[PDB]
DNA sequence: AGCATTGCTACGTCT
DNA sequence: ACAACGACATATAATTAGTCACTGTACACGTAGAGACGTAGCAATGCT
DNA sequence: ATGTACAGTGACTAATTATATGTCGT
DNA sequence: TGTACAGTGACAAATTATCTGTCGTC
DNA sequence: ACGACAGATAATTTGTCACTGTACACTACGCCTTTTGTGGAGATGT
DNA sequence: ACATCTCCACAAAAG
């Protein structure tokens, strides 16, 4: 196929020259005198130029231009050698083992001597050798991804279903990660970075939630963003929003990828109870649509705050922990105004004429119903199954509840669902007609006065056996009435519990 | 002596403004066009906003030297059909003669009033711009070939000027093959192989055939600025520039586009996102730092 | 002030040889007149041509090729915005924050709306002005050190104090780095990478000993390297070596990193009781005899190794707890081996003449005493401030303990060693004369049929008490008796006194 | 004409094999000089292994052009007086720019060597292995000035050589200051600056008054290698470069040292490092790799 | 009577 | 004398400032902290 | 056929403006 | 005056690809 | 004419050695979550 | 005198 010319140098274009004067249309009686008027300025005999012409016919512009000599690129050390060299480098380089060529030129070094060689290679020779071969492993780091384009949409899940993703809610896609910013309490000591939990659309491409919080991910965590995602917004004017997050309703799908919080029942019982699918990514690159804000946050965000951490360990800044000072309500504070006046306001990058918001707002079937809040609540508790046992007593966590119709379903299991920030009002239900039916509230004798949350429930009765104690409501109780008698999960919880609680 | 024998460059600025697909006015392009000296038959043609450089030439010459493929919307009746290597080629930078060098016809660089005088002159906006640069190129190879080419000769009236040129070749016109004519192609560099072997090209998106091989490497282009649907791809080397494959533009709305299309498409997709108003997303900006203000260890 | 031209292209070259063919000297009436071949050769007035003249007869070559104009590196923008830019770049990057030119470039923009500026600087005008600032910095990053030339030196402390290094064995040197392999127990999980801790001659370059081992940075560890380095060494015929490690003798001093187990009264009490003195580094880079090393043995022997983990986490190869597969008892094998018969041998980076072997033994200021081992072996770990009971009986840690001679005695001050690996038995000393003296050896009470450590008897104690158990050392006893450091210290129980 | 007017180049290789400081072969030499074709006396010349090319023709233009001193160990009965340009300077491209810089014709395609390789060289020990190219120096730059230039021919109006060049200008020549044409001198394209404005030139290093402030950038160097103990640090600018410091080797014996002597002694660090019986070393290698290989993984 | 010594627990602080 | 540096007003052109379409590249849980050895809180188990 | 998409880049282009030129000048 | 080894620039020595002569009939 | 003999000559790789950029500065297999089959009572029914 | 179910507590993989 076609091969053009270019880059010509100088004499190349001295060669052009006299070929664009030969150029002229001639004959024998003409030939020679108009070669020879070309060979006075070629500065050459005259057999020359016809070997020139010859190859300008033969080749064309690249033909009396001059091509490279066999011999570049392969070595003289020969077919042993080239071999030995490679095959030793890369035998040295599978495993962790890392073997770079001046350790290999060694091993030359000792081979010949055993060969009984008397002329090893040199360490130039072995470093040009794997030279290309170093740049082919070097390539591999650089080859880049086309991406989706235009509107039309799908996710990789890992049942190997390509979900597509029609209009907005249509899939939402959910993961968590730390924050790079080391936040304080109150009191400014140093607290260890937040995790950030965002829910995404993945038409219209908005942030449709977020929670930001100490947490670990779990399956309370993933239920937190949920609820913010799928119920309205509504924040006051310490929120100096000039925006407003327009965004609810629930997902059709939910794409996540495999954390045990994901892969939980109680995600998969909300996901069966508010009417959506759970599906998991293949691998992270299938959830770059939601992978991607974090860095987006990461660079126009946590960046530019005090105490930003920096996002590796070669590259914190050398007194992150000095410059730490935002904490977890005021980190929020920003984020919120991030997302609302900022992130859902720039065009999507697939589009470029609409903002993310309106790639919202106009992709709506129709308008989401204004979800029952309680309802919502209600199917984001978790739930356990116990039998309804003599005079109506059921266990659930060594406590013991009852409620006003409880003893006369004793005998069979029920379905009960439990908020582990405050178990001591259970909700019981029956399964009749293989149908779900509430009973009443089940509240924790002695216990319906405050709240008692799961976490020290655990822990105390793990720790109060070693006391040998009795386990029941009011020792439990008891273990817990004088919990003031500070420490990081305390400063952690009693802060993130202190940002939630201006509700109203 | 004979017709054929030497091909005159010609240049003009059509005095005709145009509108845009979505309503922004174009500019006046400039015509450039290859005839015979002895018929005046018009054998080449390239019209649009680019300058009178090498540029418009360089693309002249490779529309008559080619066979005259035609398409339907241009409602033709007769069929061009003036392929043929020339053999003298003369026009008003040097690289038209590395074309006539590696071509093999020399080039010796130092009558459009005929559309002055027509009403070619006086169509909307000549001299409220409702017309468009792709129905240009349907409707002035139309009226060019079917009517100012072949009809008879103002003097040496007694042969149309393409039926002079016509039976004037020495012998017969002679085909030769496209893909040898690269070189008058545009030229666009160093762009990068993505995976699968996929190029990006006028926002567009592009993809080889056996592209693949050298994705995370870099590659040229080369275009027509009538059909980018399709644009050829070469291997840069030190000295050698060697063709690797097609590639196929994708996910366009359309058969055809033309580049003046692609930068149409691009200045309304930017226009657009230069609507938007920034004042939420700027304002937060310095309330965040007025914020951080406020901070100390 | 000279200054000289460069670049000369082809149209200066031009330029120049109308110059030089003006150069030879003529009458200045035909001067005038043999000039005139200049006018067209530059398409340009006689004027001119005396005004190139000018210039090069003034400046030479340097004046006779253009200038750049005034106005480079100049910004239109103007100092307002010039400042602003430089202003907002700097104090956004000040401690942890990292702005970036195109953060700044939203405050130019946002200021600019605020002042209603009609036109404010491009954000690729807000990255032009700050590539000055980035490059100096990018500058001021990578900046080589020369390092000490020849065969004098002087190491500086943390006390401010600079000391010569004037003879081998006058400065040793110590720290502790985290070996890159991941090797594992017998038959072999995991575990988890070791500590390596070496004596580097400063004098030599030469290095007399190692301590490896899971162990962490201790003075137990300090100790048992010290006790490797000062002793002659025997390596048995298993390890095949070519080369014998001859480097043996005590330091005059001892510099280091300032680890705790460096700063440890244990370490102190072998400084006196072995005549060193010790010396704190002032920053890690007066160190570099003990970091480079480091670097060294990383590059041409861990890398080479299954369990390779790699320079950082950000380069941490992924099949290293996938195959690692040597245990310490032939890690120590390959380091002895890449210590006696290369690194000995190999040549002292900046004197070429000689080995670092041979810049020891010809380095020292004379032939030094080979000690007793069992003399580092009273240099034990001591207590004070401790009494002795008014009987033959003793007590420590709440081991409970018998003495042959201190019936003798009161209840007095007392002071006692003991080896750590072997607290079954005491060297009990006393303050005669203001002098430190031997009262007797001491044991257990009743201990003889068995062999007890301190760690496992320390950490026995805890258990002990917790569960209410009446405190003796017959009672401590079987808590030690009655896993990650199980595996780990019966791997360094694999010892050179069963094979020499 | 004048003793100023018309000074002609010269060259010669020397027949006389030299050892280093130490007592190895060498080379035999080249030599370079200029005459004053008015006054026919033998004046700026350089003398090294150095083939004859545009550098060493420029270096010993700049031997010409330059005052001659001598060292406190010659302090010798005779010396040059030469120095300024000449009117033209005859050697029959860089050559131009220097004649174009200093503003003298250069031209470009009865010679004395017989006076010394006849009557002198070829009666040493070493002549055509027992004598070093610091040596070779006072018994050429003494010579040839204290006995061939002191010499008179009546042929050129019987005056000793450099009486007739002394008396025969037409105004006399200033001195011209050694900052004026370092375009003569060597050249190195980069050296990095290191901390603390040090700078390392052959294996030596070199610090000087204000070179500290370009640490981490690249400078250029010029210097003579006839003793380079004091080399010159060059600044490049968009197309002008400009001296920027002196500088001076730190930690030398003795403040004189040759570019061939710090070749010479660091071809003795090179040699001395290559002695190794690195052969014994190798067994560590093989023997690593093979209990390496004998460790198969569990599973 | 008196303390007096003995064996843990921070709270750093450093590598 | 007239070939030397001014006095222009006007080009000439090389600077900066701005527009765009490309592309590399990190987003993928991860260092705050393990693990030594004080100075200083402590209890206790002795005893005179 | 299609991971994501923003910050930094390159390759020009419009505007600025530093200063080279040609003629007259004394 | 941290330390100092693996990688790299500029060059010479050696190898050897191929291109330049004087030529012979075409 | 072209191309065809033996040998020149511009590459090409092999090998030296002064120079410098960089890591050594100890600092990942560890924190945290979820499922889950095995196991110990201990009220209750048979 | 017995058998039964139920509630609560511990080792392996993924982010
Ligand atoms: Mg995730
Ligand atoms: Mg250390």
Not at chain 2, 33 to 56: E, H, K, Q, W
Not at chain 2, 81 to 92: A, I, M, R, V
Request: charged share 25%; net charge neutral; with cysteine.
């Amino acid at each position: 196929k076609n091969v053009i010319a270019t880059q010509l140098s100088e004499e190349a274009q001295v060669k052009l020259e006299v070929i664009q004067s030969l150029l002229e249309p001639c004959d024998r009686t003409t030939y020679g005198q108009k070669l020879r008027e070309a060979a006075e300025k070629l500065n050459v005999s005259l057999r020359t130029v016809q070997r020139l012409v010859k190859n300008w016919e033969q080749d064309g512009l690249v033909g009396l231009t001059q091509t490279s000599r066999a011999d570049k690129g392969k070595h003289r050390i020969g077919e042993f050698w080239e071999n030995f060299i490679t095959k030793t480098y890369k035998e040295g380089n599978k495993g962790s083992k890392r073997m770079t060529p001046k350790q290999v030129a060694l091993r030359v070094e000792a081979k010949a001597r055993e060969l009984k060689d008397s002329k090893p290679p040199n360490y130039k020779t072995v470093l040009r050798v794997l030279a290309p071969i170093l740049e082919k492993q070097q390539k591999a780091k650089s080859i880049r991804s086309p991406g989706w384009r235009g509107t039309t949409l799908s996710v990789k899940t890992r049942e190997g279903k390509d979900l597509s993703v029609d209009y907005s809610n249509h899939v939402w896609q959910c993961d968590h990660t730390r924050v790079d910013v080391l936040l304080v309490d109150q009191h400014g000591e140093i607290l260890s970075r937040p995790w950030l939990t965002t829910v995404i659309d993945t038409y219209s491409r908005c942030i449709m939630g977020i929670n930001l919080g100490f947490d670990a991910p779990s399956s309370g965590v993933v239920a937190l963003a949920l609820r913010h995602a799928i119920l309205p917004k509504r924040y006051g004017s310490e929120y100096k929003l000039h925006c407003e997050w327009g965004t609810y309703g629930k997902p059709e799908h939910f794409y996540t990828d495999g954390g045990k919080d994901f892969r939980s029942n109680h995600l998969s019982q909300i996901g069966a109870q508010l009417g959506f699918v759970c599906h998991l990514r293949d691998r992270p690159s299938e959830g770059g649509v939601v992978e991607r804000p974090f860095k987006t946050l990461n660079d126009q965000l946590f960046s530019t705050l005090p105490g930003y951490t920096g996002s590796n360990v070669q590259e914190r800044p050398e007194d992150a922990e000095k410059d730490a000072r935002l904490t977890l309500r005021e980190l929020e504070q920003l984020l919120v105004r991030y997302i609302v006046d900022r992130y859902n306001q720039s065009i999507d990058a697939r589009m470029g004429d609409q903002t993310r918001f309106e790639r919202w707002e106009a992709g709506l079937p129709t308008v989401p119903v204004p979800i029952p809040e309680r309802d919502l609540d209600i199917c984001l508790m978790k739930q356990s199954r116990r039998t309804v046992q003599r005079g109506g007593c059921l266990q659930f966590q060594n406590l013991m509840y009852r409620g006003e119709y409880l003893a006369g379903y004793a005998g069979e299991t029920v379905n009960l669902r439990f908020d582990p920030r405050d178990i001591t009002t259970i909700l019981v239900y029956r399964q009749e007609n293989n149908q779900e039916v509430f009973l009443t509230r089940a509240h924790a004798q002695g216990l319906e006065t405050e709240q008692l949350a799961l976490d020290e429930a655990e822990a105390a009765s793990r720790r109060l056996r070693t006391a040998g104690k009795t386990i029941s409501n009011q020792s439990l109780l008891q273990e817990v009435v004088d919990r003031d008698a500070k420490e990081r999960q305390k400063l952690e919880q009693t802060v993130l519990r202190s940002a939630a609680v201006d509700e109203s | 002596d004979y017709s054929n024998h030497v091909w005159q460059c010609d240049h003009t600025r059509v005095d005709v403004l145009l509108v845009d697909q979505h309503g922004e006015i174009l500019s006046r392009p400039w015509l450039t066009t290859v005839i015979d000296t002895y018929s005046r038959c018009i054998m080449g043609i390239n019209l649009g906003f680019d300058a009178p450089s090498s540029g418009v030439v360089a693309l002249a010459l490779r529309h008559a030297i080619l066979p005259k493929r035609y398409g339907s919307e241009y409602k033709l009746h007769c069929e061009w059909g003036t392929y043929g290597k020339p053999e003298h080629f003369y026009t008003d930078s040097n690289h038209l003669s590395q074309i006539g060098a590696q071509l093999g016809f020399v080039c010796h660089l130092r009558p459009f009033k005929t559309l002055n005088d027509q009403l070619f002159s006086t169509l909307p906006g000549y001299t409220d711009a409702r017309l468009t640069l792709r129905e240009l190129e349907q409707l002035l190879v139309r009226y060019i070939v079917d009517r100012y080419n072949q009809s008879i000769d103002a003097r040496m009236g007694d042969q149309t000027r393409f039926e002079r040129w016509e039976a004037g070749l020495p012998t017969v016109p002679v085909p030769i093959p496209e893909r040898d004519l690269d070189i008058c192609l545009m030229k666009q560099s160093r762009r990068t192989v993505q995976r699968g072997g996929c190029l990006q090209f006028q926002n567009l998106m592009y993809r080889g055939e056996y592209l693949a091989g050298y994705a995370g490497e870099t590659v040229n282009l080369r275009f027509d600025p009538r059909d980018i649907t399709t644009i050829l791809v070469y291997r840069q080397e030190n000295n050698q520039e060697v063709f690797l494959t097609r590639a196929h533009a994708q996910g366009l709305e359309t058969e055809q586009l033309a580049l003046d299309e692609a930068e149409a498409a691009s200045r309304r997709l930017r226009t657009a996102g230069k609507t938007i108003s920034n004042q939420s997303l700027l304002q937060e900006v310095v309330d965040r730092d007025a914020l951080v203000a406020t901070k100390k260890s």
